[PDB]
Write a protein that binds this ligand. Structure first.
Ligand SMILES: CC(C)CN(C[C@@H](O)[C@H](Cc1ccccc1)NC(=O)O[C@H]1CO[C@H]2OCC[C@H]21)S(=O)(=O)c1ccc(N)cc1
Lengths: 99, 99
């Protein structure tokens, strides 16, 4: 799709079998989801945002379907204010910015 | 033009007659720039992201050019680690997400 920006670019995703809403976030290097259970191994990591640093759980090589487009990559889980889809997955689905 | 998301979507902007590098950020409601001493009235605000909140100064109706496209609107100024062009100005320069 082409998505304009007069509203937040919120989309439905599928992950670990479940639906969620998430924000397409070109200013995020990484995909960060609010607290949820995912299968498999994870590693403790830290990541910084505008307000400082948080602890997250890093899950690798995770399948995520975004507006019907498939990705498989790293998902961080922790106290983000909103689920965000970062560039690690936006690149997989072929996103670009256009003006 | 089209901006890839393999790397951070940094572009040149002009504001308050300084040229700066800033992120084209679909995840940001409002534009936030690194600390700078702009002229004019402002109002305090808190904005929140990963890690919590920062305090910023809200300026209104500031001219900002972004890759040669003119815009004018709200600019927040405070201790962000990166200059961020948010949706308030992205719409004004014609920016969409596409996949
Ligand atoms: C978390 C979003 C809902 C909101 N943020 C925009 C977001 O794009 C920031 C923008 C950003 C970018 C760099 C540093 C701080 C903030 N990215 C971010 O937090 O990404 C994190 C996940 O991937 C990592 O890569 C970048 C930081 C990590 S935000 O910076 O907090 C923000 C909040 C309010 C406004 N008006 C402006 C910006």
């Amino acid at each position: 799709p082409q998505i304009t920006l007069w509203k937040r670019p919120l989309v439905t995703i599928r992950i670990g079998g479940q639906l969620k809403e998430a924000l397409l976030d070109t200013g995020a290097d990484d995909t960060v989801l609010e607290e949820m259970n995912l299968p498999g191994k994870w590693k403790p990591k830290m990541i910084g945002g505008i307000g400082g640093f948080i602890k997250v759980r890093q899950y690798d090589q995770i399948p995520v379907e975004i507006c019907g487009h498939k990705a498989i990559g790293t998902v961080l889980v922790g106290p983000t204010p909103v689920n965000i889809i970062g560039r690690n997955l936006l690149t997989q689905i072929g996103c670009t910015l256009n003006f």
